[PDB]
Amino acid sequence: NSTATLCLGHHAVPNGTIVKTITNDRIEVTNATELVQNSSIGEI
């Protein structure tokens, strides 16, 4: 009459990053990338 418990879960990280979606403007995700090139090189 011995039992056993099996659980399921997902990835997680401590310091994440915020993104904007349809539902909410702030939401923390695991990993995200930047789509706007805000800087450049000094020369042509």
Partner 1 sequence: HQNSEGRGQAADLKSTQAAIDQINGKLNRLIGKTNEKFHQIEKEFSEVEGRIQDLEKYVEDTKIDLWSYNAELLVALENQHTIDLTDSEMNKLFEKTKKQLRENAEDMGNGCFKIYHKCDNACIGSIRNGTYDHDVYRDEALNNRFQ
Ligand X SMILES: *[C@@H]1O[C@H](CO)[C@@H](O[C@@H]2O[C@H](CO)[C@@H](O[C@@H]3O[C@H](CO)[C@@H](O)[C@H](O)[C@@H]3O)[C@H](O)[C@H]2NC(C)=O)[C@H](O)[C@H]1NC(C)=O
Ligand Y SMILES: *[C@@H]1O[C@H](CO)[C@@H](O[C@@H]2O[C@H](CO)[C@@H](O)[C@H](O)[C@H]2NC(C)=O)[C@H](O)[C@H]1NC(C)=O
Least CB distance to partner 1 at residue 13 (A): 13
Structure tokens at 32: 């995200």
Distance between CA atoms of 20 and 29, rounded to whole angstroms?
A: 10
Among 33, 37, 39, 40, binds ligand X (CB under 6 A): 33
Structural contact between residues 20 and 26, judged by C-beta atoms closer than 8 angstroms: yes
- The gap from C-alpha 34 to its chain's centroid, in whole angstroms, comes to 12
Residues 1 to 30 in contact with ligand X, rule: CB under 6 A:
none
Residues 1 to 44 in contact with partner 1, rule: CB under 8 A:
1-10, 19-25, 27, 29, 35
Site residues (vs partner 1, CB under 8 A): 1-10, 19-25, 27, 29, 35
